[PDB]
Design a protein around this nucleic acid. Structure first.
Lengths: 83, 95, 97, 109, 95, 109, 83, 97
DNA sequence: TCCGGATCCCCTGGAGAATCCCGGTGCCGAGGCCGCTCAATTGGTCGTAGACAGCTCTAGCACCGCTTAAACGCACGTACGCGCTGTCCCCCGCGTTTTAACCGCCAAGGGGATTACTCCCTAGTCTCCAGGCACGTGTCACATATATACATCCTGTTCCAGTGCCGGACCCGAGC
DNA sequence: GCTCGGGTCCGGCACTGGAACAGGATGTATATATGTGACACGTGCCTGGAGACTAGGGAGTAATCCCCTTGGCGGTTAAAACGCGGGGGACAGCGCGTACGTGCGTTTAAGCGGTGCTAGAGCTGTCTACGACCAATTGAGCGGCCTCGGCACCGGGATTCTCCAGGGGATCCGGA
């Protein structure tokens, strides 16, 4: 029922692919865990606002609308899911 | 049935057929278009409400709409925008 | 003799390959596990629409790739080609978090 | 004895709905009182914005020899226009990717 | 003959006296506080408007105000602020 | 014949005006209707924020041995608190100055 | 009234003073030129916004109030000017 | 033989001085002259409230000083103590202007 | 020292290999058609917000006259970027093994969403009043000046260890 | 074989390079004195906030249903993960040459005080253009469905990129 470690699910090759999309051709070995950390921070920051939007709506299921609102409040507004 | 849900699909479809009669759209692209047009609409409407509150005017009018699009949109896009809006106002005034 | 490319040539090839392509880079179900894991830390037993998870996933990859291109610029600015965690620490401090 | 039901978008000669945008401004709570010409202006502006973005996307798609526009085409269109990039710097396109760009020092000699 | 411009100098001066009877204030610092209270008030009010807009509520209530307080204010500031506002609205309810 | 005049801020027991904030929200056009307890809650959270930033200004001023608060003291208060910095990252105070901050590599030896 | 060359009106030691407030220990001699350019661009943007606000306001005088608006919609809010 | 401080000592002293002080580092008259000059290119016959000029003044020192700690972080990141124009261009491009 | 062979660096060519390009094919979202319905339309009314006229006064604009603060500028100097080199080691390329991602398929049920209802609250209007604002006044908190007091920072001065070397000791060779 | 003298080498000594340390000068703090104006506090007021009552409507709540989400089971493989190497990159050391730092003399231009004008900021009364509110109505816009061709995937051949193994010149070292 509970989950305790899924930050390791963001594997090293996925981070490598993202860095290739960022254009980085050489990645140090110390990058992966701190990118996991900054991912953890960003995810906390967005989903806290998302679940706040949800619980104000008195829902037990989040909407994608709430995720869009959380990103547009944070200054990283998302196109392609509204409506 | 279901309660009606509003979207901007068909208007953008006429716009595409005016600018490119031959090509089509993906529904993902149309979702981006709805997010875009709603985003720009709320930005300009927020600027409009901001200006109308500032100058202690109870009406929203077109004048601050040119003000809002001129402050928000950059440069040549802004003055082009003022151009089609001005001529659209001229035909709307003349019915 | 089995062929072997010199280093960086292949890496540049995945740069071109993944930069032309748009398809999603991380595995989606471990991402769903991670987002549920962090989500239950605020409130118990939340339910997710798959579209919401994919959208938040897309925003997450956008945030990462943006800070990646910033740390790429920083690492070049430090006369190097390899990014290191002080480079990305610089990038996060400059951006304002 | 009513006249023929004519539309204000046709009165402007534009395609974006005057009545819908007018209703959204009335119910979006931006003023208590709304002028007549402002939704016409706004509809014209938005229609021109959609027109120019769709022009850029269609030109990119015909460059990419695809006859249906793609989110990738939208991203490549908005990122390659400077003033739209100034407008849309802080937004993310779903399924969009990024500009093809490698830095000069990353290239081999 | 003059027309007023309203301000928050009296209230901030009072709450300064309950928190510190023995401290003074400069007027330009009070202008900074005026900008502070107006800026935070407009942030909470606009976020409250968006929350009322999302769930199709035409009435603004204290619940989404409390939601916006969690939304903007981080953590400790949020939980304590929710606490004081909650006890305050309990006294107002009893009044 | 009529109840004696007794304000709503006293009913809340708060110093910030319930009536003024209520009127501002009514003419701020954020909703068509307004709940009674919402401006009370808003005045409460505003008064808590102003309160805590006033003790921060007061003890920062007392460290400088000045009984009247300074915009320099306000800037020192907001920049030395992490959560208020997160609240106030993108605002600058007039005559605020900067924190006393030197990089360690800039020091000699 | 009508002036030409006031980009040099921000003197070099003034830029040194800003750098010392920024904690710069050593400044290159080239620096003052691009700081003048960046200052010009920044003031140009905010003053374009300001004259837009005042021109909508039907005023010939630039007020501080509209300057506060122009900065704060640009994400660079200032406090202490009645805003 | 007369006194002469080593390089950087005086610089650190005015660093401490100007960090302690809050007063405006730009002369008011040429700055407002430049403001009138640039504003003339957008609209003729403009007049200025003085407090407007000071408000956009601390806007100018705010934006400048912020780019200067950004430039300081960039410069110390390259193991250097002296800033160059590519540092400011880097800081601006990371900030996205 | 000159000439001739050896050798190394660049210079080139060709093989592998990853990718682009050209059809083939089958597939499923997109566009188009049709039915419905509800929101834009049309018309009239009635109120009221803003444009305008007009007046006032005030703050900005301009000018001038001193009065130094500092900006400019030169000159000499350290120190810092910076480029080369060298050296180590870290991470990409590639191969093999593992594994869980994912499709896809099916069950089940949970709550999202909708409709009906009835009511709690609130916008609105009237009346009245006291709270906050402009105004006036005074007054001590802070700005500034001046005189000490110490911090600190660079640099001359003496100290201490590294080291070459003066003298003794040891070893080696030669004379008796 | 003994003995003695010289040569040479190493231990202590003195010479010398490097570092701890005191001291002076300057800059910053700090103590005391003094004015002054901005903060604080009393005052008139009027108008925005509070009190009473009402109409009604947005919103809470009750029922449902069904759609959407969660759970679980089997297969496959692509993705991950782990190991080897080895070269490319990180990084440190070293010289070096410049490029601001610092310091002092000068120019001047910013700043402050004072004066005069008025352009426009701003307040006030009118009233009219303009637009919210509401009944009738419809046709434009949305939901459902259908068909297909634009496109995703598959497969074969061409093409361009990469990189290392033979030629061409240049340079270096040895021999005459």
């Amino acid at each position: 029922k509970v989950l305790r470690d899924n930050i390791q699910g963001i594997t090293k090759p996925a981070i490598r692919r993202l860095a290739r999309r960022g254009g980085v051709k050489r990645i140090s070995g110390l990058i992966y865990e701190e990118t996991r950390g900054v991912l953890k921070v960003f995810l906390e920051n967005v989903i806290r606002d998302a679940v706040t939007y949800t619980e104000h709506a008195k829902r037990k299921t989040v909407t994608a609308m709430d995720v869009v609102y959380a990103l547009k409040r944070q200054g990283r507004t998302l196109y392609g899911f509204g409506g | 049935k279901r309660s009606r849900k509003e979207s901007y699909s068909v208007y953008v479809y006429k716009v595409l057929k005016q600018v490119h009669p031959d090509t089509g759209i993906s529904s993902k692209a149309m979702g981006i278009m709805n997010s875009f047009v709603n985003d720009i609409f709320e930005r300009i409407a927020g600027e409009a409400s901001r200006l109308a509150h500032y100058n202690k005017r109870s009406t929203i009018t077109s004048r601050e709409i040119q003000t809002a699009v001129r402050l928000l949109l950059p440069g040549e896009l802004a003055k082009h925008a003022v151009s089609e809006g001005t001529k659209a106002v001229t035909k709307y005034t003349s019915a | 003799k089995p062929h072997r490319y010199r280093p960086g040539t292949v890496a540049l090839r995945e740069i071109r390959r993944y930069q032309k392509s748009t398809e999603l880079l991380i595995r989606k179900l471990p991402f769903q596990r991670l987002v549920r894991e962090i989500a239950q830390d605020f409130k118990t037993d939340l339910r997710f629409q798959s579209s919401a998870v994919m959208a938040l996933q897309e925003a997450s990859e956008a945030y990462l790739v943006g800070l990646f291109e910033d740390t790429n610029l920083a690492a070049i600015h430090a006369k190097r080609v390899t990014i290191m965690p002080k480079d990305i620490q610089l990038a996060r401090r400059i951006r304002g978090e | 004895a009513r006249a023929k039901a004519k539309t204000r978008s046709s009165r402007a000669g534009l395609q974006f709905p005057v009545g819908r945008v007018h209703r959204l401004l009335r119910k979006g709570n931006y003023s208590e009182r709304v002028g007549a010409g402002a939704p016409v202006y706004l509809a014209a502006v938005l229609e021109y914005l959609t027109a120019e973005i769709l022009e850029l996307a269609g030109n990119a798609a015909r460059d990419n020899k695809k006859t249906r526009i793609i989110p990738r085409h939208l991203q490549l269109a908005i990122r390659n226009d400077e003033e739209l990039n100034k407008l849309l710097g802080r937004v993310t396109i779903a399924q969009g990717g990024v500009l093809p760009n490698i830095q000069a020092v990353l290239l081999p000699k």
